[PDB]
Amino acid sequence: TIKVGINGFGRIGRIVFRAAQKRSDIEIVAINDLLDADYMAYMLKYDSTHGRFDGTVEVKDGHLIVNGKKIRVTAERDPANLKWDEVGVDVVAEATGLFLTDETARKHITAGAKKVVMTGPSKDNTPMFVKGANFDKYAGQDIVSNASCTTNCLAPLAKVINDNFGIIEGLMTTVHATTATQKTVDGPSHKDWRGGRGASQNIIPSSTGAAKAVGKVLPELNGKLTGMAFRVPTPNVSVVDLTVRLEKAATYEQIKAAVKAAAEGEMKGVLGYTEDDVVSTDFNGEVCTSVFDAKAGIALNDNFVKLVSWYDNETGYSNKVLDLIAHISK
Amino acid sequence: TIKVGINGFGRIGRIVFRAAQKRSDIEIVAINDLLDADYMAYMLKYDSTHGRFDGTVEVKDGHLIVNGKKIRVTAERDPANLKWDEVGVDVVAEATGLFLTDETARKHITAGAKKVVMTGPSKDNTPMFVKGANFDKYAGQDIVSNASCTTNCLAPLAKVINDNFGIIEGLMTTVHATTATQKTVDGPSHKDWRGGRGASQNIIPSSTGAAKAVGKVLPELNGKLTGMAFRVPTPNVSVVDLTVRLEKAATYEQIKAAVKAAAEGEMKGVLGYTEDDVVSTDFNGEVCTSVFDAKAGIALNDNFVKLVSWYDNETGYSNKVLDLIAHISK
Amino acid sequence: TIKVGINGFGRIGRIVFRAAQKRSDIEIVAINDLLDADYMAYMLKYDSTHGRFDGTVEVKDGHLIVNGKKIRVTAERDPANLKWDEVGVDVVAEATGLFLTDETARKHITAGAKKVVMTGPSKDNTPMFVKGANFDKYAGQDIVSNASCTTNCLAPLAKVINDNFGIIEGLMTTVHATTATQKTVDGPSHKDWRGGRGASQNIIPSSTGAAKAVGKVLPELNGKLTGMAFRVPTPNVSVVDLTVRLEKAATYEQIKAAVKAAAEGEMKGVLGYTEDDVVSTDFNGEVCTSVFDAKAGIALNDNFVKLVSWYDNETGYSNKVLDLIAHISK
Amino acid sequence: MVKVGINGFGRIGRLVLRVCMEKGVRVVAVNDPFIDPEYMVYMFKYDSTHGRYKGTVEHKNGRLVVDNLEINVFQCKEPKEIPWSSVGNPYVVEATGVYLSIEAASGHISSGARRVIVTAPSPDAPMLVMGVNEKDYNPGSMTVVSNASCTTNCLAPLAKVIHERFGIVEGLMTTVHAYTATQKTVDGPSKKDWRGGRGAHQNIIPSSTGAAKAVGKVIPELNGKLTGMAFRVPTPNVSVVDLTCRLAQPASYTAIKEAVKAAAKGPMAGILAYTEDQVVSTDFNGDSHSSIFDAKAGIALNDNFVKLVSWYDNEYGYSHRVVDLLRYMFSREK
Ligand SMILES: NC(=O)c1ccc[n+]([C@@H]2O[C@H](COP(=O)([O-])OP(=O)(O)OC[C@H]3O[C@@H](n4cnc5c(N)ncnc54)[C@H](O)[C@@H]3O)[C@@H](O)[C@H]2O)c1
Ligand SMILES: NC(=O)c1ccc[n+]([C@@H]2O[C@H](COP(=O)([O-])OP(=O)(O)OC[C@H]3O[C@@H](n4cnc5c(N)ncnc54)[C@H](O)[C@@H]3O)[C@@H](O)[C@H]2O)c1
Ligand SMILES: NC(=O)c1ccc[n+]([C@@H]2O[C@H](COP(=O)([O-])OP(=O)(O)OC[C@H]3O[C@@H](n4cnc5c(N)ncnc54)[C@H](O)[C@@H]3O)[C@@H](O)[C@H]2O)c1
Ligand SMILES: NC(=O)c1ccc[n+]([C@@H]2O[C@H](COP(=O)([O-])OP(=O)(O)OC[C@H]3O[C@@H](n4cnc5c(N)ncnc54)[C@H](O)[C@@H]3O)[C@@H](O)[C@H]2O)c1
Ligand SMILES: O=P(O)(O)OC[C@@H](O)CO
């Protein structure tokens, strides 16, 4: 059983935690945030997006008790002081958003852990892995990244589309839910001025390297995709709107057939396929990181098409983080 | 004119600033915040709740220029290092939320200003003034507080009802817009666990001092009112719900008569009165700090009644902050 | 086993349906609305608030197949034409909002049903029943009402407080989630002008009979309670805020103990109790019609207190409709 | 001295009356069988999105009285029964969404109207987007016209500038669109659009448009070269078009930016606007333009494959254009 330690118990850390409960191959043996253990329990117990926690949580001697299982709680601002080895943590899930470089993340290995998974795209050359795209390329690196939730939606779709028909070029938009970084009313964000504007009131243009990043986990698609985002007032679930030019002409039904073949075979559990009249809330809790929406899409012609695919940016991503942890331990 | 300086260009600072431009007695000469001059210009020009700035804004050189007038831009964390005198500031509007004691607020006085108005309830013995309640008890103090937006709503109504019918006792609920202190999705709020929960997603119970603080600005009501808040997913405008036991019997028609008489008389422009079928967005931009809703309220009998009054937590309070500045410098 | 027909497959109709799947005493045999069978399947399968249907659903020969049981689907505008006898229906859940008098509800009996439960307050002297208050005063009548969601929250709480301390008088506010009668953007609501205004933009005052209606189910409280609502931008879960004058002095601990013992005792399943830092999404899917919030409430003194109780206006009420159905069929 | 009658006092019809008050265009009558004079006053005086009406609104003797200007209120179900003749034969703004065919909107002509503007796409009435093809209006042959959709008025002025300058070989549009009156507050019935009945405030809802095809009608060279779709999202107003296109002639994003600025400053002033500021949707709440280009929000893959972004207040910009078009129609009377 792979022991894991979550650093940062925010949205991802918490939903990764809930997702690990249903796995046999992984134990979450420790958590580090900047919160008292009782507050950490409260945040685990109750969730505005995902309902109440299925199971028991208790606090004794400053340690969480979750379904009879002790979890070490710490509050070390500096990942250097974490003593990961006094709990036997094999891998740490880096979920604070702060340590997305080798140098910063490597402190976990210095503090006792063996390997690290960053729960965001790396800010340096830390290699990125996306299930159904390039998990098999992993070479034993002790520090990795699961890229972003959007790359986790886009890449599996793009692989199938490229593998069957050939993407000459593609431009992507993600209509994306509100995230922690945003502001409830017009506030400061000197990094990102639009991003400070009240999240409940606005459609907010936003930039992303999610489409570029696909060409890293799929090198054959390098230089061929790029894109952007609009943040909208939903608390969870997002959607990719990919417009691609194809080398081989394909009817919309041919494209449907291809994705459905992959979703049922090669990409099962990663890429999903629907023909129902679905909306965002229908995918709250979706574990598949990309779910093709057959009826949403549209073809101008056999060689030019807008494709649509859904993802629960919280749940799907958190699940593949555990899949990445699992894979690098194999 | 009275030269004002703003500390903290947040929601109140910005609305105070906009309201300042319509006044002939008051001129804002400097703002201090953790913001670039270009970013302050952006935040002033565009507003999700209150629309575009009515006036001209430029950064020349520069150098914030608004309506032709130069505004000094500083980025001092420590108020003691502001040199307010170097631009000739008499009153400082302290609107960061962080300096609500005489100790801290007095750093502006040593930085060269003459007086200070806190734009929030004082966390020490610092005196609080609410217009239509106790502005005339100002006895030349150099540091004062303007109370809270909610106290500015309830006190005016409370006094009219006390003066005419006598409050034996009251319990109050404010159904309240979301604010900058809340979170877009479930996030850390260690001093207020409910307040960390998704702002857009939830009705959030919240504790408020504003009903007890009515006792401070109306001593005749000390220990006679307490209450609480429900934060709800609206970006501006709140409402007070005052359940009162009355000494003297009173028909709703007599309550109305009194509220309207006070609105047209001694509390003109502070206390308002409506019989229309109004909802919250109808008081977006409301200058009156308390607007009585005749049709919303209800009486069980002539001694037990529920009274409803609206307020634009942002706009009305910002206007009364400016009134407090005018008054203390008479 | 009791055979039920649902008239009106809206929010209550569809949630009553789901809840009936989790019971063995009651089986839904027939459904009427002005909708095709395949559209009904869709509305059952997917719910924005309560997630995907737990189980199977399909259409076959113009009828539903839900968890392998054939449901009759009809599309009659007139209840008299419904032929409930052809499916052998015992009780009709009348949830269109249109047939809330004996006169109109009785068309279901004309159509072959034994009894009818109205899923709303009856608009004549048709008797009303709220579980925890007066189920046991059911005297064999063939048409009844389960009252409103708000009464079902208030009645149990009121009864517990009155029985222990004596409510001299009380005023109530409900901060209520948006419902189907509201409008997305400002539109016509010629019966309730405020209720035509954009639901998601506004705090909207509303009238309610819920507190007077408590006087009908608990005659001892007749003339002693009234109130009103504020509709707010949340899609589900509502809250009662009861301000009560107590005959007998009671500490907030004593009030807590009273509710907790009723919760675990004679009102188990109806009245709930909590001391956690809860918000509204924490009760999404709650079966109890009233969950006392201990920390949220506040007393001025031992004889004047504000009490708060949560309720899922959809789920809780729907469960109790099935409870009322099962009771009147005993 | 155009005189306008408004049929249907909804979002478009109320806001059309507002823009008419703002421009001194005389609205002589409003017909709505479901809103009476008293209730029109309330719906016009208070607006959740665009705020209180700045001015006075009263009712007197069964008339709507806005800024002392009396407006007749009718209560007829059918266009052919409305007394347009009794109020001086105005041009009618057909804003119900129910009489969309030439045959349907012509009822107003039977009952005394001089012209009709349908405030939506028509299956047969000529579309006329100001800035693009309003000169196609033939007063001699057209008594019923369509002012297209809100989305079409955003896409077309942009699409014109880009086609003329660089050539659009092909394009796919998405509009991320505010919710409207047709949607529901919580999941409810929408027989003809299952997704559109799901709660507007909780959901991103994929939705249909013919706005990009419609551009091929008003700019005939773009016929068959544009299509698209929509996502309805939890905002009360203001929408945005996301146009992904292949250009015939290579163009840097700076060349593109300069072409749009040009049009905005000259031939499409008041219709097409250009911004480089860090704007968001509320920044165009109350904006009069049909299309506001967002220079910094867009992205180019290369000189021939770009994604362009333009904003539009789907209510207030579109109302402004209805009033623009009927003033234009009136100027052309022989
Ligand atoms: N939110 C999503 O849907 C999503 C999806 C995929 C990836 N991600 C990525 O995952 C990361 C975290 O995302 P999130 O949404 O959970 O953000 P979040 O704000 O919810 O989580 C950050 C958490 O880390 C804690 N923290 C801050 N500094 C710390 C430190 N010094 N030591 C320990 N804990 C600290 C905070 O208390 C907070 O709870 C980010 O890199 C984000 O981009 C987010
Ligand atoms: N917004 C309301 O409804 C409302 C109503 C009544 C009172 N208030 C009070 O107004 C005050 C400010 O609240 P707000 O709502 O404007 O929140 P806000 O977040 O919008 O304002 C805080 C601002 O202060 C700035 N700031 C932080 N540290 C600073 C530093 N040390 N030096 C200079 N600037 C700094 C921030 O950049 C931010 O712009 C609070 O005390 C609050 O209680 C707010
Ligand atoms: N939703 C709540 O929180 C709640 C709580 C308590 C009580 N109620 C009550 O339940 C009743 C229904 O409320 P709802 O929220 O389900 O509304 P809803 O709009 O979701 O349900 C009404 C349904 O009835 C159908 N309908 C209309 N006319 C019909 C006809 N003549 N024959 C058959 N079906 C017809 C509609 O298609 C719709 O599906 C109302 O009386 C309401 O007051 C609602
Ligand atoms: N809302 C937008 O963003 C927008 C933008 C562009 C075009 N449009 C179009 O304008 C039209 C109306 O849209 P809206 O948003 O104002 O809708 P709305 O629902 O707000 O208003 C429709 C109005 O028509 C009235 N009405 C219904 N039947 C009538 C009849 N028989 N006679 C007279 N009046 C009647 C109703 O009382 C209602 O007030 C639609 O065709 C729509 O596609 C809307
Ligand atoms: O959906 P409707 O109400 O027609 O809205 C019109 C326009 O906003 C786009 O279609």
Class of domain D1-147+315-334: alpha beta
Looking at the fold, whether A143 and A165 belong to one and the same domain comes out as no
- CB-CB under 8 Å, B237 with C232: no
**Which residue in chain C has the smallest CA separation from B201?**
C234
* Residue B8 Cα to chain centre, angstroms: 15
Task: Let me know: does D63 contact D57? Beta carbons within 8 Å.
Answer: no
Domain that holds residue B6: 1-147+314-330
Can you spell out the DSSP letters for B283-301? GTT--SSEEEETTT-EEEE
A235/A244 Cα distance (integer angstroms): 29
Q: Is B277 on the interface with C (CB under 8 A)?
A: yes
* Number of structural domains found in chain A: 2
Q: With contact defined as beta carbons under 8 Å apart, do B151 and C208 qualify?
A: no
Partner-chain contact D280 A203, CB within 8 Å: yes
Task: Look at phi and psi of residue D275 and say left if phi exceeds 0, alpha if psi is from -120 to 50, else beta.
Answer: beta
Clarify whether residues A325 and A292 are in a common domain. no
Asked whether the beta carbons of residue C186 and residue D11 sit closer than 8 angstroms, the reply is yes
| Residues of chain C positioned with their CB less than 8 A from the CB of D35 | 188, 190
Q: Count of alpha carbons within 13 Å of C93, Cβ hemisphere only?
A: 38
Q: What are the beta bridge partners of residue B2? A: B26
> Can you give the resolution of this entry in Å?
2.4
What ligand is nearest to the CA atom of residue C97?
A: 3
Q: Do D235 and A169 touch (CB under 8 A)?
A: no
Q: Which chains touch D (3 or more CB pairs under 8 A)?
A: A, B, C
Residue of B nearest to A201 (CA): B48
Residue whose C-alpha is closest to residue C177's, from C37, C5, C18, C48: C48
HEC letters along C243-302: EEEECCCCCHHHHHHHHHHHHHCCCCCCEEEECCCCCHHHHCCCCCCEEEEEEEEEEEEC
Annotated binding site of C for NAD(+): 11-12, 33, 77, 119, 313
For the domain spanning D148-314, the CATH number is 3.30.360.10
The amino acid occupying position A73 is: V
Give yes or no: residues C133 and C263 share one domain: no
User: Distance of CA D99 to CAs A187, D8, D102, D116, Å?
Assistant: 45, 11, 8, 11
Cβ atoms within 10 Å, residue B139: 6
Q: Which parts of A are annotated binding residues for D-glyceraldehyde 3-phosphate?
A: 148-150, 179, 208-209, 231
Of the residues B14, B33, B108, B152, which should be mutated to test ligand 2's pocket, given the most ligand atoms within 8 Å of the CB?
B33
Same domain assignment for residues B103 and B43 = yes
B5 and B121 share a domain?
yes
C202 and D48 within 8 Å at the Cβ level: the answer is: yes
Of D144, C95, A14, A99, nearest in space to B188 by CA: A14
Q: How many CB pairs under 8 A join A and C?
A: 32
| Ligand 5 atom 3: residue of nearest CA | D182
For residue A126 the two structure tokens come to 């830390």
Question: How far, in Å, CA of D29 to CA of B307, rounded?
Answer: 40
CB contact under 8 A, B185 and A233: no
Q: Are C190 and C199 in contact (CB under 8 A)?
A: no
- Cα→Cα distances C233→B175, C34, C198, C238, D11, Å: 12, 28, 9, 11, 20
Looking at chain D, the domain(s) classified CATH 3.40.50.720 span 1-147+315-334
Query: Is A301:D170 a contact under the CB 8 Å cutoff?
Result: yes
Distance A12 CA to ligand 1 centre (A): 6
Q: How many CA atoms lie within 13 A of B162 on its CB side?
A: 21
- Which string of DSSP letters, residue by residue, matches D35-77? S-HHHHHHHHH--TTT-S-SS-EEEETTEEEETTEEEEEE--S
Q: Whose CA is nearest to atom 23 of ligand 1?
A: A10
Ligand 3 centroid distance, CA of D189 (Å): 11
User: Is B149 among the residues known to form the active site?
Assistant: yes
**How far, in Å, is the centroid of ligand 3 from the Cα of C102?**
18
Cβ pair D176:A230 closer than 8 A:
yes
Q: How many CA atoms lie within 13 A of A185 on its CB side?
A: 19
Question: Chain D contacts of B52, Cβ < 8 Å?
Answer: 283
What whole-number distance in Å separates Cα of residue A13 and Cα of residue A20? 10
Chain B residues whose CB is inside 8 A of the A188 CB are 34-35, 39, 43
Chain C positions in Cβ-Cβ contact with residue A49 (cut-off 8 Å): 281
Q: In what order do the strands lie in the sheet with D3-7?
A: D57-60, D63-66, D69-74, D26-31, D3-7, D91-94, D115-118, D144-146
Same domain, B320 and B267: no
Q: What is the position in ligand 4's atom list of the atom closest to the CA of D12? A: 16
For residues A175 and A243, membership in a common domain is answered with yes
The residue among C130, C151, C137 whose CA lies nearest residue C225 is C151
Query: Is residue A119 lining ligand 1, measured as CB closer than 6 Å?
Result: yes
Closest partner residue to B243 among C175, C238, C243, by Cβ? C243
Q: Give the CATH number of the domain where residue A266 resides.
A: 3.30.360.10
CATH number for the domain harbouring residue B32 = 3.40.50.720
How far apart, in Å, are the Cα atoms of A34 and each of A7, A42, A94? 10, 14, 14
C39 vs D contacts (CB less than 8 Å): 189, 191, 194
**B135 & B154 share domain:** no
CA–CA distance, C46 with D184 (Å, rounded to integer): 15
Count Cα neighbours of D46 within 13 Å in the Cβ-side half-sphere.
23
- Bridge pairing between strands B57-59 and B64-66: antiparallel
In total, the C-beta contacts within 8 angstroms joining chain B to chain C are 129
Same domain, C252 and C162: yes
Q: Which of D289, D265, D259, D148 is nearest to D213 (CA)?
A: D148
> Of B230, B240, B242, B244, which to mutate for an interface test with C (greatest number of C Cβ within 10 Å)?
B230
Q: Which ligand is nearest to the CA of A189?
A: 2
Two tokens, residue B293? 């809703």
Q: Are C45 and C141 in a shared domain?
A: yes
The alpha carbon of B326 is separated from its chain's Cα centroid by a whole number of angstroms, namely 15
Per the omega criterion (within 30 degrees of 0), is the bond before B63 cis?
yes
Shared-domain flag, residues C330 and C251: no
- Going by alpha carbons, the residue nearest to atom 31 of ligand 4 is D77
Which residue is closest in CA terms to ligand 4's atom 4? D315
Residues of B annotated in the binding site, as ranges? 11-12, 33, 77, 119, 148-150, 179, 208-209, 231, 313
Cβ contacts of D297 on chain A, cutoff 8 Å: 205, 228
**Which residues of D line the annotated binding site for NAD(+)?**
11-12, 32, 77, 99, 119, 314
Q: Report helix, strand or coil for A66.
A: strand
Q: Give me the residues of B, 137-176, that contact A with CB < 8 A.
A: none
DSSP letters, C196-262, are GS-GGG--EEE---HHHHHHHHSGGGTTTEEEEEEEES-SS-EEEEEEEEESS---HHHHHHHHHHH
Helix C37-45 with C11-21: angle, nearest 10 deg: 70
Mind telling me how many Å the CA of C232 is from chain B's nearest CA? 7
CA of B199 to the centre of ligand 5 (A): 29
Tell me where in chain D the CATH 3.30.360.10 domain(s) lie. 148-314
Do residues B320 and B303 share a domain? no
Whether C229 and C173 have beta carbons less than 8 Å apart is answered as yes
CB C226 within 8 A of CB B300: yes
